[PDB]
Symmetry: D2
Subunit: 58 residues, 4 copies
């Protein structure tokens, strides 16, 4: 079952930074559980990452 | 209700090209209906677009 | 000649937000003058945009 | 000095696929030597990667 849900606040654990709300999901063979995250600093900009790259915060 | 479903083959209508399968979805205020599309030419690479930017093909 | 130089602080004019420093450049037929911009809120994350999408700030 | 030049044909070595021509460059602390690559399959679409992720082909 899904690690995050819509609206969870998450950030990238390492490397390039990103922080904001879960706004969608995707699934490919390379990334069977991926999420779309809308930046809380840059409204409207969305980046997609594998679940292993993300952690939930407050 | 959703314009596309998982696995639909879609392409960008104009501007930068992209073509492949729907592999997810996202929703923000700027893009209330968006999709993740995995390239059929470049497996594993995914880009996200608003529904208005995409059209279904075969 | 180039509208921006390395290190200029710029933001997206409209739509999805982005703000930070110019860190590179690109040129294609669709985007003959494009820039890479590293977010000032999310260090390490870089997005690329056409010059017409960007404006210089302080 | 730079590993690639404008117009070199390159591909991603591993993970998500990408192949096409070098069309620009970028430099950040996380990625001190990065390149913009326009897909040869999807004209106009550009992705950016660190040099270590790319290899030159024919």
């Amino acid at each position: 079952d899904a690690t995050f849900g819509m609206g969870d606040r998450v950030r990238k654990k390492s490397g390039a930074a990103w922080q904001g709300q879960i706004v969608g999901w995707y699934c490919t063979n390379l990334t069977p559980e991926g999420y779309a995250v809308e930046s809380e600093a840059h409204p409207g900009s969305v980046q997609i990452y594998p679940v292993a790259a993300l952690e939930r915060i407050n």
